[PDB]
């Protein structure tokens, strides 16, 4: 099904009345005045902006935001170094090397997410079997120096501890969907 836009169905022959109406349109800028009315109208509408520090634009539970590594309620970090979070990262951001901890458990000696390399796809959130690496809600982590953006296990684990309460609520809300 098609539709002609800007196709004049027929040649309306000028009638004085028509001509006057048109000539008035050119002479007294009638349509231009129409446009001014629209903007005056909004001037009276409530502005949609938010006080950025005081009010925040709404983000729902799946917002990917900033990486964090979670821990079991007991206190044992969730990651067991299966290293498929490294395998599926599209940007090669996550670097993981592991060795059996003294307890005998499997754990990662080094877990480094290069956030400048990361493109926040959220697949790592997807891939983890124990769901140790999660996309945390915080988006405000702008840093003065490039090195700060590179994150080792201690920053991510600390990021995990700080935001665990909200991360748990967010995962709680969206897990049925996944």
């Amino acid at each position: 099904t098609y539709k002609y836009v800007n196709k004049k169905e027929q040649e309306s022959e000028v009638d004085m009345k028509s001509a006057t109406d048109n000539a008035a349109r050119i002479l007294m800028w009638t349509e231009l005045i129409r446009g001014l009315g629209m903007t005056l109208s909004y001037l009276f509408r409530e502005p949609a902006t938010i006080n950025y520090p005081f009010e925040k634009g709404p983000l729902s539970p799946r917002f990917r935001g900033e990486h964090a590594l979670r821990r079991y309620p007991s206190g044992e970090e969730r990651c067991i170094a299966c290293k498929l979070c490294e395998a599926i990262c599209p940007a090669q951001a996550i670097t993981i090397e592991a060795e059996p901890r003294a307890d005998g458990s499997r754990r990662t000696t080094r877990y480094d997410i290069d956030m400048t390399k990361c493109i926040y796809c959220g697949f790592c959130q997807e891939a983890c079997p124990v769901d140790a690496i999660v996309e945390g809600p915080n988006f405000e982590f702008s840093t003065e120096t490039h090195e700060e953006l590179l994150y080792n296990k201690e920053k991510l684990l600390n990021n995990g501890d700080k935001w665990e309460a909200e991360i748990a609520a967010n995962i709680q809300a969206d897990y049925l969907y996944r």
Binding site: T1, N6, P90, I119, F123
Partner: protein, 385 residues
């Protein structure tokens, strides 16, 4: 001829464009656009990345129509795997595909005006655009660059409040198109700036491979959404807005109509979305559900292999074209039996359009060229790839 380059920093240059102009006085006699300022190596990087981990790349080729772009890769990979997405997923891709064409057109119509000098239309619609991204963020978690449309099906089910919120946006959006409609469609100043500028004849448009609103604006009747119905575009009713003459106005008017026609398609999708699963049930192609991988061994093995290695699509090659908001976006994916692709030629509606700038901007002023780029809706991510 006073060679002058439209350097990248200039706002009208979309950030990266070095149009070497030869100014025969203010009249410009030749343009030699020097693209390449945003070539990222998108198609040599994909060869080194598995099919799922290359999806994200497709959200960054045209960065203003993310999901429609990732519906072309998803359809391609799906063809090469002879798998089809479940019924609910196909409606969701059509629902998100039209939200993206409204999103691209708000981008194209308002930024064109920003270039010409009308500043208010951009602000009114951009507030309507963040309303829309929210829909991306609420369904995928990313305002833009979602990664929601997956090679098989889509990634996660719609949250339980999205379709009501999409109705409320679509219910009131048309007045918003109506409002810039009044402010920038009859202004003698717009018409003069846009009418009879960059006229492209019908056969020339086909020969230059324009394939988009540029094809439809000159009267050729081609929409890959009705001609070759991908996904469910066979079960939704819409009217292609064919323009008559080809001036940059007829092309604007067509873009404003497609936003209106997309609201007609979005309405149908909310009214008729089926109950069902959002991703095909073959664990070999789409990853197993979180509960299943944590309770059934066959699912953990399938999750481990899919995330670590890949789908391993059967050897073959396909060119799949979908009507992206800019025009025909196609992926020629050549596939060896391996889990990672061998070649992925992204046909960008835009490589062809920018080539046409020299022919279309003929006998035109420095100012007309700003309108000519604006009416091609060119995003240099797609052209540079």
């Amino acid at each position: 001829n006073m060679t002058l380059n439209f350097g990248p920093q200039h706002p009208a240059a979309h950030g990266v464009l070095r149009l070497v102009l030869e100014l025969s006085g203010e009249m410009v006699r030749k343009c030699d656009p020097h693209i390449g300022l945003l070539h990222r190596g998108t198609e040599k990087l994909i060869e080194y990345k598995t099919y799922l981990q290359a999806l994200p790349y497709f959200d960054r080729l045209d960065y203003v129509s993310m999901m429609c772009n990732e519906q072309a890769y998803s359809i391609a990979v799906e063809k090469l795997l002879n798998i089809q997405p479940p019924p609910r997923a196909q409606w969701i891709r059509v629902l998100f595909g039209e939200i993206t064409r409204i999103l691209n057109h708000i981008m194209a119509v308002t930024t064109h005006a920003l270039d010409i000098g009308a500043m208010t239309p951009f602000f009114w619609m951009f507030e309507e655009r963040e309303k829309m991204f929210e829909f991306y963020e609420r369904v995928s978690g990313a305002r833009m660059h979602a990664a929601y449309i997956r090679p098989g099906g889509v990634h996660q089910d719609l949250p339980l409040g999205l379709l009501d919120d999409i109705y409320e946006f679509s219910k009131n959006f048309s007045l918003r198109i109506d409002e810039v409609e009044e402010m920038l469609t009859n202004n003698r100043i717009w018409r003069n700036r846009t009418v009879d500028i960059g006229v492209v004849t019908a056969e020339d448009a086909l020969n230059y491979g324009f394939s988009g609103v540029m094809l439809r604006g000159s009267g050729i009747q081609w929409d890959l959404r009705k001609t070759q119905p991908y996904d469910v575009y066979d079960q939704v009713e819409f009217d292609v807005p064919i323009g008559s003459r080809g001036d940059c106005y007829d092309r604007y008017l067509c873009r404003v109509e497609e936003m209106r026609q997309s609201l007609r398609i979005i309405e149908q999708c909310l009214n008729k979305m089926p109950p069902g699963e959002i991703k095909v049930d073959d664990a070999k192609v789409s990853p197993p559900k979180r509960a299943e991988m944590k309770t059934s061994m066959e699912s953990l093995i399938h999750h481990f292999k899919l995330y670590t290695e890949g789908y391993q699509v059967p050897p073959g090659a396909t060119y799949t074209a979908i009507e992206a908001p800019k025009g025909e976006f196609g992926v020629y994916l050549v596939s060896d039996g391996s889990s990672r692709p061998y070649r992925c030629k992204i046909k960008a509606p835009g490589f062809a359009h920018l080539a046409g700038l020299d022919k279309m901007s003929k006998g035109h002023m420095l100012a007309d060229v700003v309108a000519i780029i604006g009416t091609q809706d060119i995003v240099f991510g797609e052209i540079d790839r």
